[PDB]
Each structure stands twice: as structure tokens, then as C-alpha cells.
Amino acid sequence: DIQMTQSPSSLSASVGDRVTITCRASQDVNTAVAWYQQKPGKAPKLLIYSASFLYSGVPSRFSGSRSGTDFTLTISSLQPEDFATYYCQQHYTTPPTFGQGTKVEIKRT
Amino acid sequence: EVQLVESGGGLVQPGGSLRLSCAASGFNIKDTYIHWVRQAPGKGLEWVARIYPTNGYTRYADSVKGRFTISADTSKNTAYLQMNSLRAEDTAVYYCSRWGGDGFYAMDYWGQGTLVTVSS
Numbered sequence: 001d002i003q004m005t006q007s008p009s010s011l012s013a014s015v016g017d018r019v020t021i022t023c024r025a026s027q028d029v030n031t032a033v034a035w036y037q038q039k040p041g042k043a044p045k046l047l048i049y050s051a052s053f054l055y056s057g058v059p060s061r062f063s064g065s066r067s068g069t070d071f072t073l074t075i076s077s078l079q080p081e082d083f084a085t086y087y088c089q090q091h092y093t094t095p096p097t098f099g100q101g102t103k104v105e106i107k108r109t
Numbered sequence: 110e111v112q113l114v115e116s117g118g119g120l121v122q123p124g125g126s127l128r129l130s131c132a133a134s135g136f137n138i139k140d141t142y143i144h145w146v147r148q149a150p151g152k153g154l155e156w157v158a159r160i161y162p163t164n165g166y167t168r169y170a171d172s173v174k175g176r177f178t179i180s181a182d183t184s185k186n187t188a189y190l191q192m193n194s195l196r197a198e199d200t201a202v203y204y205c206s207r208w209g210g211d212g213f214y215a216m217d218y219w220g221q222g223t224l225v226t227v228s229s
Contacts, residue, residue, distance in 0.1 A: 032214070034215035034216070036154075036216075041222075042221075042222075043204055043219040043220065043221055043222055044154065044204070044206075044216070044219055045219075046215055046216065046217045049213065049215035049217075050215075055215070055217065087153065087154060089154075089215075089216075091214050091215065094159070094168050095156045095168075095170050096144075096156050097156065098153055098154045098155070098156070099153075100153050101153045
């Protein structure tokens with residue numbers, strides 16, 4: 001019951017753009033951070049575990065990194081199917097706790 | 110065929126009760142930890158309880174402690190969430206998931222979601 005503070009709340013970008021989501025752990029959580037995506041009405045999907053490992057089958061445009069208490073997700077060239085909400089999670093102790101989310105939307109105009 | 114299937118949600122009035130189901134398929138419940146994670150309508154994901162089905166170990170979030178019970182039928186390969194004394198605040202889509210295995214404590218598989226509505 002470490003809090004994960006996720007920046008930003010939302011962002012707008014386009015197909016092809018590079019994007020960076022951030023989570024700050026309120027305490028040291030070591031490398032025990034996972035990143036989930038979720039599309040509306042659907043269940044989360046694991047993307048990254050142990051702060052920087054790709055889960056099977058997830059697109060290589062995704063990567064995680066850590067620096068201290070800070071965990072970052074980059075998507076290097078946004079594809080259509082990447083416009084969804086992203087959550088970080090720490091699972092170092094009980095309760096596992098989640099960042100509040102980042103909806104990644106497309107700039108329309 | 111590693112999948113979790115949930116069941117049991119509906120409309121229920123305040124101070125009512127509900128038993129949700131997470132039936133495992135492809136692996137076995139006894140081996141892993143099973144989590145229930147909810148998500149209120151506007152909101153993000155919130156962990157509620159956890160159980161290790163071999164030894165019977167459970168942990169609960171403060172919100173739920175004393176109101177809910179998570180249990181496991183290992184023969185049936187199903188976990189359960191018994192939610193009694195339902196407040197309007199517990200309206201959410203409930204998700205069970207698992208920890209993959211050893212040294213892999215990321216929730217790698219999740220069920221579809223079952224919605225529990227609580228109002229008059």
C-alpha cells in the first residue's frame with residue numbers, strides 16, 4: 001500500500017508518435033512493477049513485468065525502464081490499436097496498488 | 110486454454126449479498142494465487158482479496174475486510190467471492206486474475222469482468 005502516482009491523466013497524439021507514461025512509487029518497490037493496457041469494456045492485459053520485460057506476444061514498440069522510484073513506459077510509434085488506457089501496478093507488498101491511469105487518445109483535428 | 114471465466118453479478122440492493130465465481134481452465138487453482146480486482150464505473154482498478162488455494166491463505170483490502178470472503182474449491186478449480194453487507198460504493202466490474210507462477214508475480218491472466226450494481 002505503496003502508492004503509484006501516474007502522469008499524465010490523458011494525452012492526445014497521432015499514429016506514429018512516440019509517447020511516454022510515468023509512475024512514481026511512493027517507496028522503494030525494487031523492480032516489482034507491471035504495466036497493463038485496457039480497452040473499454042475489456043479486461044486489463046499484461047504488457048510489461050519486472051519493470052522492463054515484455055510479456056509474450058506484446059508488440060516490440062513497448063518498453064519499460066526504471067530509475068529509482070520512477071517507472072516509465074514508452075511506446076515508440078503509436079499504432080491504431082494502442083489507443084487505450086495504461087496502468088502501472090506495484091506488487092512488492094500487499095495490497096498491490098495501481099496508478100490512476102493514462103488514456104492515450106488521438107488528436108482528432 | 111488458460112482462461113478464467115467469471116459469473117454471479119447482478120443488481121442487488123444495499124445490505125444485500127452476492128457470490129461471484131472465477132472458474133479456472135488450462136491450469137490449476139491450487140498452484141497459483143487468485144486475485145479479485147474491481148473497477149468502479151468512473152474509476153481505476155482496485156485490488157480487493159487474494160487466496161492461495163493449496164494452503165487456504167487469504168489477504169483482503171480494508172474496504173472489503175469483514176464484508177467479503179474469498180474461497181477456493183480446488184476440485185472444481187473455481188475461486189469465489191462472497192460479498193455480504195453490500196454498500197452502494199461496491200458497484201464495480203469485478204475481475205479475478207492470477208499470478209503466473211514462480212518469481213512471476215504479475216497478473217498475466219484475467220477473467221472478462223462481472224458487474225455488480227448496488228442501488229435501491
